């Protein structure tokens, strides 16, 4: 209705970063992932794999103590801030991060919001997902704040009922990105990426293989890692959404769309990303 | 003897569901898996992988507390109801599920039967396997009850000795599906799928690679997931049994039948299912 | 020197079992693996994978309590006898097994020998490896006892120094198989399989990729599983040793011999075994 | 500037060891890896996989008690010295090792230095990495001491600021290898391998896929294993650095350089090493 353009293959190709010969892990920064709780542990593994696959230099995972041992055998490249998401409720971060994500696998509690308020005093891009998404406003700060709601979460944030939202997705996503002054990645078929300066794009990739638990956790991690290796955080968000969907499309070439498990998106991304270089 | 027809490739092709572009995890429902105990933990991983591979939207695994950490690194897409199978002994479920399975890796105790009685007050299809199979009767309810005995379990349920059962498998499975008013998936070479309205089919797929611990746990999960994405639960049961056997047949093309491990059925299913689309 | 014959491809082909359409896990029996301790846990995973890959019907792993959780995510098809190897020191087994192995990852203690004495009152083939190998004698019983020493272990059992043993491997292995009335699988390049009735064979397969920790643990499991699916336990031992070596030979076609990890033998066996059918 | 030569493919080919038919795990020695702590557990898995992939006979991992269970399911071929890195602070090793590595995933503490001092009284090559790297001197001993700093660690060791170091890498690495009488593997693009007898080489392999957490942990393990199977420890160091980089180059043929995870280097090495035989 607003003729929102698609972020196309050519846009992805033009904006994906190089990984120069003369670079080291510091060049690509340290990200912080605040995710995973005792009854929702998996989201931390899913977002952690997503992030480390996506071009960062180092990853610190601030997860609940009992979730740590579940990540290590799969992702021994991550290090930990023990009970990090809980500790972030109590004080500003003393360490500097290139980008921060909070929420996958976290409960929708006031303590999580206290951690959000603390993380937002850092000077870096911050992603809020899942349990960190609430009806609230956001402080003026330098770095972008990126919200990644599915339509149910968007209802929670805005009071716009899902059946109404789905009739005018880009109109609502844009209106709320403007009002909140946050980026909004409104998930679904033709995911909307709405920027608070009024730029808006639709994502052309993806399919129903993604319509299963965990896929958004992987996405959150992909955005996190891409924020570390892209100079322009807009490109990081857009490329992450695009490549996430493209991994599902590769899967369905030889596998049924009913059978994908989220973590496999991370396994597919290395070859998919290569195709866009 | 009763000329029971085979559920054929063409039946599978005609009844497997689509996964539409305009769908999300809610479209494919949330299943509940009540499985896995401290000395039989593996069944929960096997049924959990089977279920998430088979087209559901979300999976909640109600397993013993100490089994949880053993599933997460392999299946980070599942969430948990801590000690769920034990808690189900005490009260009706307050959450709504698209389908429920109970029994793989559970002991054959009265407490498991109490959980069965509670789960049966939900309005959804329910699968009973392994430890949940007992000599008993079933309350009138809307959703189908699907029993998945091997011949030893069928003896436990009915008093029909295995050596007699094996002479007239479909006759006994049909008689007991009618008497109990449950679906009976009577396992073995030429698995019988007997419906309580008198429909009955034989499964043409599978081989001796399946004659090893855990394969039925994987099957239970496959039925669970297929109940979530098929409109007709009869088709879900039939397709699950068929595709389970077909995965073993793919394995034996290049691998010895002596060497299959149950979890690999789940790894094979993505490509096998694609062939039937 | 004694012109001991090789167990050849044609011998393997002639003696490997079928896995009939009309069979179930009971047909292929339940094995018991008594293995793995707190500072040597890995041997239980290695022997467990080896066994379940090798044609048994069910596997019960009697391992230390804290080792259980380390096996489950890799081998969810196994079930457990909690602290089984320790409990076997106290009483005869009340359950019937098709075959038993004891020792991989167990300490060389008197308590392990007490478990050995108890396991030997069962009527089935029994394999002793690693910590279960000691200087001792064996009671008259129906089922074969199969010892799987490397030359260091053979010295421990016999007092024959390794440098002397290696000069006349088959002569010593035969002499001691006769004296003890046990099968002796004397490991190394050209493994000797000596039977207490005086039959003796050399194994023609294998290479230096096997000269690394854990490979014998995998072998012990392979023998265990093959004892369950072969009618003649001599063939089970011989085929296991042969196929174990053949998996290393397949590895070295495209991978360096320096780089094999024991568990990968188990991953290779499905395709290798197929070649001999 | 000093015209330091590259260690080339032809050098690697000429110096990689054989793995003879008549060999066993003792031929290739037992290594000790002192690595992994509660908030940095992954380094032990990464270095452990690296080491066992690289031609040793046995590996003992002296890691913190709670890290053990995280390694076993991935690397069941390793055995353990429980809390080994901590115990090494208290006394000389009573066991003989072919080579020792200390530091990956260890904190930069005085207790780690006490363990270093004890390990150095053994008569074998010793690698110091990560937490074991400090500003210090080294006792006269037979076996080489091999330091594996990245430029940040080199600053910690020497006071040479990174921006100055990077202008004259080989000059500084050589000067400090001479002064300390240690081997220095100065990491980065064109890694410098400086020997204390004044030999020095540059590594021609590798790319930005390596510029991510954990890759140096894998390298430390590769050096450790190669020290066990090479007669000349200089060749072991040089070959390890070379093959490590070559694995990254193989990865980038079909996968994006942004997406490599360190543990995958270990998965690639078997085929890469084969190419140089
Ligand atoms: N190749 C390199 N060149 C320059 N600095 C480096 C290099 N590798 C690591 N560093 C520095 O050391 C830090 C990493 O320390 P660590 O994570 O403790 O191993 C980086 O953030 C850089 O500041
Ligand atoms: N049918 C579909 N087509 C394309 N993308 C989808 C579809 N269903 C779900 N997704 C994506 O899967 C993810 C779901 O996020 P979440 O609900 O947080 O797991 C988002 O990236 C969605 O845009
Ligand atoms: N693409 C979508 N369109 C409409 N509703 C959705 C979509 N994705 C998620 N939801 C809603 O939110 C619920 C999932 O919430 P959660 O499992 O907490 O992430 C679903 O059951 C739906 O009711
Ligand atoms: N020989 C065989 N041919 C076909 N299917 C088999 C065979 N042996 C076992 N199965 C199947 O393997 C599963 C065994 O279930 P369970 O005993 O619960 O593990 C069922 O789906 C059986 O029908
Ligand atoms: N296809 C089958 N035909 C006959 N008996 C079976 C079959 N599958 C399982 N059983 C019996 O039930 C036992 C397995 O029980 P469980 O291990 O408790 O699932 C087997 O040892 C058999 O005695
Ligand atoms: N160089 C070699 N050639 C053939 N087989 C070997 C070689 N080195 C070791 N093995 C085998 O590897 C296993 C070692 O057993 P263990 O010492 O118990 O791990 C046995 O099956 C040996 O025969
Ligand atoms: N094929 C073989 N030939 C000679 N000695 C061996 C062989 N395999 C193992 N050993 C000896 O036994 C030791 C291994 O014992 P273990 O690690 O306890 O299994 C080796 O270090 C050797 O001294
Ligand atoms: N851009 C690059 N080119 C080649 N090697 C690299 C590059 N970045 C990092 N490395 C290597 O990756 C490892 C990093 O070690 P560490 O910082 O200890 O993880 C070392 O082997 C470095 O030489
Ligand atoms: Mg989500
Ligand atoms: Mg069963
Ligand atoms: Mg051994
Ligand atoms: Mg390092």
mmCIF file of C-alpha atoms in Angstrom, chain D residues 8-196:
data_model
loop_
_atom_site.group_PDB
_atom_site.id
_atom_site.type_symbol
_atom_site.label_atom_id
_atom_site.label_comp_id
_atom_site.label_asym_id
_atom_site.label_seq_id
_atom_site.Cartn_x
_atom_site.Cartn_y
_atom_site.Cartn_z
ATOM 1 C CA UNK D 8 56.238 -23.519 2.306
ATOM 2 C CA UNK D 9 54.193 -26.452 1.124
ATOM 3 C CA UNK D 10 57.412 -28.196 0.091
ATOM 4 C CA UNK D 11 58.863 -27.764 3.637
ATOM 5 C CA UNK D 12 55.654 -29.222 5.117
ATOM 6 C CA UNK D 13 55.690 -32.146 2.705
ATOM 7 C CA UNK D 14 59.330 -32.915 3.466
ATOM 8 C CA UNK D 15 58.854 -32.926 7.257
ATOM 9 C CA UNK D 16 55.425 -34.395 8.079
ATOM 10 C CA UNK D 17 55.851 -37.768 9.849
ATOM 11 C CA UNK D 18 54.768 -41.243 8.825
ATOM 12 C CA UNK D 19 52.402 -43.341 10.845
ATOM 13 C CA UNK D 20 53.920 -46.773 10.425
ATOM 14 C CA UNK D 21 51.982 -50.055 10.281
ATOM 15 C CA UNK D 22 54.116 -51.322 13.199
ATOM 16 C CA UNK D 23 53.197 -48.639 15.762
ATOM 17 C CA UNK D 24 50.792 -48.229 18.646
ATOM 18 C CA UNK D 25 49.567 -45.363 20.789
ATOM 19 C CA UNK D 26 52.786 -45.470 22.894
ATOM 20 C CA UNK D 27 54.835 -44.731 19.808
ATOM 21 C CA UNK D 28 53.060 -41.351 19.531
ATOM 22 C CA UNK D 29 53.240 -40.481 23.215
ATOM 23 C CA UNK D 30 50.975 -39.026 25.859
ATOM 24 C CA UNK D 31 50.420 -35.299 25.943
ATOM 25 C CA UNK D 32 49.161 -33.226 28.796
ATOM 26 C CA UNK D 33 46.792 -30.286 28.235
ATOM 27 C CA UNK D 34 46.368 -27.857 31.144
ATOM 28 C CA UNK D 35 43.406 -25.760 30.030
ATOM 29 C CA UNK D 36 39.827 -24.660 30.635
ATOM 30 C CA UNK D 37 38.335 -22.938 33.708
ATOM 31 C CA UNK D 38 34.787 -22.357 34.878
ATOM 32 C CA UNK D 39 34.129 -19.093 32.877
ATOM 33 C CA UNK D 40 36.409 -20.040 29.995
ATOM 34 C CA UNK D 41 35.612 -23.780 29.553
ATOM 35 C CA UNK D 42 35.534 -23.888 25.769
ATOM 36 C CA UNK D 43 39.272 -23.486 25.288
ATOM 37 C CA UNK D 44 39.815 -26.956 26.725
ATOM 38 C CA UNK D 45 37.491 -28.538 24.161
ATOM 39 C CA UNK D 46 39.053 -26.538 21.360
ATOM 40 C CA UNK D 47 42.687 -27.351 22.342
ATOM 41 C CA UNK D 48 41.739 -30.943 23.187
ATOM 42 C CA UNK D 49 40.211 -31.607 19.766
ATOM 43 C CA UNK D 50 43.169 -29.840 18.134
ATOM 44 C CA UNK D 51 45.644 -32.067 19.989
ATOM 45 C CA UNK D 52 43.895 -35.420 19.438
ATOM 46 C CA UNK D 53 43.458 -34.590 15.760
ATOM 47 C CA UNK D 54 47.187 -33.949 15.421
ATOM 48 C CA UNK D 55 48.891 -37.332 15.739
ATOM 49 C CA UNK D 56 49.477 -37.922 19.427
ATOM 50 C CA UNK D 57 48.900 -41.326 21.020
ATOM 51 C CA UNK D 58 47.068 -40.371 24.216
ATOM 52 C CA UNK D 59 45.746 -37.095 25.720
ATOM 53 C CA UNK D 60 45.322 -36.287 29.387
ATOM 54 C CA UNK D 61 43.331 -33.084 29.975
ATOM 55 C CA UNK D 62 44.008 -31.402 33.337
ATOM 56 C CA UNK D 63 40.986 -29.170 33.474
ATOM 57 C CA UNK D 64 38.712 -27.948 36.154
ATOM 58 C CA UNK D 65 36.348 -30.567 37.508
ATOM 59 C CA UNK D 66 33.192 -28.915 36.101
ATOM 60 C CA UNK D 67 34.669 -28.609 32.598
ATOM 61 C CA UNK D 68 35.233 -32.372 32.240
ATOM 62 C CA UNK D 69 31.586 -33.289 31.473
ATOM 63 C CA UNK D 70 31.501 -30.641 28.711
ATOM 64 C CA UNK D 71 34.381 -32.287 26.815
ATOM 65 C CA UNK D 72 33.508 -35.970 27.063
ATOM 66 C CA UNK D 73 30.507 -36.163 24.608
ATOM 67 C CA UNK D 74 32.567 -34.401 21.935
ATOM 68 C CA UNK D 75 35.991 -35.942 22.645
ATOM 69 C CA UNK D 76 35.453 -39.298 24.424
ATOM 70 C CA UNK D 77 39.049 -40.278 23.496
ATOM 71 C CA UNK D 78 40.596 -37.967 26.098
ATOM 72 C CA UNK D 79 41.206 -38.918 29.712
ATOM 73 C CA UNK D 80 41.440 -36.518 32.646
ATOM 74 C CA UNK D 81 43.547 -35.271 35.485
ATOM 75 C CA UNK D 82 40.880 -33.809 37.645
ATOM 76 C CA UNK D 83 41.668 -30.141 38.526
ATOM 77 C CA UNK D 84 45.041 -30.791 36.952
ATOM 78 C CA UNK D 85 46.039 -27.194 36.218
ATOM 79 C CA UNK D 86 45.343 -26.281 39.816
ATOM 80 C CA UNK D 87 47.171 -29.331 41.247
ATOM 81 C CA UNK D 88 50.239 -28.521 39.047
ATOM 82 C CA UNK D 89 50.666 -25.358 41.139
ATOM 83 C CA UNK D 90 51.569 -27.583 44.106
ATOM 84 C CA UNK D 91 54.139 -30.067 42.863
ATOM 85 C CA UNK D 92 56.216 -31.373 40.003
ATOM 86 C CA UNK D 93 54.459 -33.830 37.719
ATOM 87 C CA UNK D 94 55.124 -37.445 38.738
ATOM 88 C CA UNK D 95 53.998 -38.765 35.311
ATOM 89 C CA UNK D 96 56.095 -38.449 32.145
ATOM 90 C CA UNK D 97 54.595 -36.702 29.149
ATOM 91 C CA UNK D 98 55.807 -36.381 25.583
ATOM 92 C CA UNK D 99 54.721 -32.713 25.475
ATOM 93 C CA UNK D 100 52.741 -30.331 27.679
ATOM 94 C CA UNK D 101 50.567 -27.291 26.940
ATOM 95 C CA UNK D 102 49.340 -24.832 29.523
ATOM 96 C CA UNK D 103 47.082 -21.755 29.454
ATOM 97 C CA UNK D 104 44.134 -21.804 27.032
ATOM 98 C CA UNK D 105 41.090 -20.786 29.048
ATOM 99 C CA UNK D 106 43.111 -20.187 32.227
ATOM 100 C CA UNK D 107 43.041 -16.915 34.160
ATOM 101 C CA UNK D 108 46.131 -14.698 34.195
ATOM 102 C CA UNK D 109 47.040 -15.417 37.806
ATOM 103 C CA UNK D 110 50.081 -16.135 39.959
ATOM 104 C CA UNK D 111 48.707 -19.684 40.598
ATOM 105 C CA UNK D 112 48.907 -20.365 36.849
ATOM 106 C CA UNK D 113 52.513 -19.166 36.899
ATOM 107 C CA UNK D 114 53.268 -21.546 39.780
ATOM 108 C CA UNK D 115 51.881 -24.396 37.633
ATOM 109 C CA UNK D 116 54.096 -23.163 34.730
ATOM 110 C CA UNK D 117 57.174 -23.296 36.962
ATOM 111 C CA UNK D 118 56.375 -26.864 37.954
ATOM 112 C CA UNK D 119 55.621 -28.057 34.404
ATOM 113 C CA UNK D 120 58.960 -26.602 33.268
ATOM 114 C CA UNK D 121 60.897 -29.026 35.498
ATOM 115 C CA UNK D 122 59.668 -31.871 33.196
ATOM 116 C CA UNK D 123 61.939 -32.940 30.326
ATOM 117 C CA UNK D 124 59.681 -32.338 27.361
ATOM 118 C CA UNK D 125 58.606 -29.493 25.106
ATOM 119 C CA UNK D 126 56.192 -27.101 26.809
ATOM 120 C CA UNK D 127 53.743 -24.685 25.162
ATOM 121 C CA UNK D 128 52.530 -21.599 27.043
ATOM 122 C CA UNK D 129 49.442 -19.762 25.709
ATOM 123 C CA UNK D 130 46.751 -17.324 26.802
ATOM 124 C CA UNK D 131 46.542 -17.134 30.610
ATOM 125 C CA UNK D 132 49.987 -18.701 31.025
ATOM 126 C CA UNK D 133 51.628 -15.840 29.093
ATOM 127 C CA UNK D 134 53.176 -13.215 31.365
ATOM 128 C CA UNK D 135 56.170 -10.897 31.604
ATOM 129 C CA UNK D 136 58.771 -13.266 33.026
ATOM 130 C CA UNK D 137 61.951 -15.240 32.351
ATOM 131 C CA UNK D 138 62.538 -18.966 31.785
ATOM 132 C CA UNK D 139 64.855 -21.499 33.410
ATOM 133 C CA UNK D 140 67.544 -23.364 31.494
ATOM 134 C CA UNK D 141 66.054 -26.798 30.619
ATOM 135 C CA UNK D 142 66.442 -29.337 27.726
ATOM 136 C CA UNK D 143 63.108 -29.156 26.016
ATOM 137 C CA UNK D 144 61.911 -26.131 24.094
ATOM 138 C CA UNK D 145 59.490 -23.628 25.578
ATOM 139 C CA UNK D 146 57.022 -22.388 22.951
ATOM 140 C CA UNK D 147 55.097 -19.120 23.546
ATOM 141 C CA UNK D 148 52.067 -18.442 21.346
ATOM 142 C CA UNK D 149 51.107 -14.750 21.890
ATOM 143 C CA UNK D 150 48.893 -12.627 19.758
ATOM 144 C CA UNK D 151 50.122 -9.036 19.619
ATOM 145 C CA UNK D 152 48.146 -8.054 22.744
ATOM 146 C CA UNK D 153 49.755 -10.861 24.661
ATOM 147 C CA UNK D 154 53.162 -9.921 23.239
ATOM 148 C CA UNK D 155 52.651 -6.403 24.688
ATOM 149 C CA UNK D 156 51.828 -7.991 28.042
ATOM 150 C CA UNK D 157 55.037 -10.086 27.869
ATOM 151 C CA UNK D 158 57.432 -7.357 26.608
ATOM 152 C CA UNK D 159 56.026 -3.818 26.995
ATOM 153 C CA UNK D 160 56.274 -3.319 23.209
ATOM 154 C CA UNK D 161 53.012 -1.563 22.284
ATOM 155 C CA UNK D 162 50.915 -3.283 19.606
ATOM 156 C CA UNK D 163 51.046 -0.372 17.188
ATOM 157 C CA UNK D 164 54.856 -0.454 17.284
ATOM 158 C CA UNK D 165 55.082 -4.267 17.220
ATOM 159 C CA UNK D 166 52.972 -4.436 14.059
ATOM 160 C CA UNK D 167 55.478 -2.264 12.182
ATOM 161 C CA UNK D 168 58.385 -4.719 12.720
ATOM 162 C CA UNK D 169 56.830 -8.061 13.716
ATOM 163 C CA UNK D 170 59.658 -10.397 12.815
ATOM 164 C CA UNK D 171 62.342 -8.062 14.259
ATOM 165 C CA UNK D 172 60.577 -7.956 17.620
ATOM 166 C CA UNK D 173 59.675 -11.673 17.643
ATOM 167 C CA UNK D 174 63.287 -12.617 16.897
ATOM 168 C CA UNK D 175 64.744 -10.205 19.467
ATOM 169 C CA UNK D 176 62.468 -11.584 22.150
ATOM 170 C CA UNK D 177 62.900 -15.245 21.199
ATOM 171 C CA UNK D 178 66.648 -14.612 21.594
ATOM 172 C CA UNK D 179 66.332 -12.688 24.863
ATOM 173 C CA UNK D 180 63.947 -15.160 26.483
ATOM 174 C CA UNK D 181 65.479 -18.267 24.847
ATOM 175 C CA UNK D 182 62.015 -19.462 23.915
ATOM 176 C CA UNK D 183 60.273 -20.169 20.663
ATOM 177 C CA UNK D 184 57.814 -17.374 19.865
ATOM 178 C CA UNK D 185 54.848 -17.967 17.555
ATOM 179 C CA UNK D 186 53.713 -14.316 17.068
ATOM 180 C CA UNK D 187 50.234 -14.625 15.741
ATOM 181 C CA UNK D 188 48.468 -12.695 13.044
ATOM 182 C CA UNK D 189 48.427 -12.476 9.291
ATOM 183 C CA UNK D 190 51.929 -13.837 8.378
ATOM 184 C CA UNK D 191 52.458 -15.421 11.760
ATOM 185 C CA UNK D 192 56.107 -15.270 12.758
ATOM 186 C CA UNK D 193 57.808 -18.404 14.073
ATOM 187 C CA UNK D 194 60.955 -17.274 15.831
ATOM 188 C CA UNK D 195 63.393 -19.784 17.334
ATOM 189 C CA UNK D 196 65.844 -18.941 20.119
#
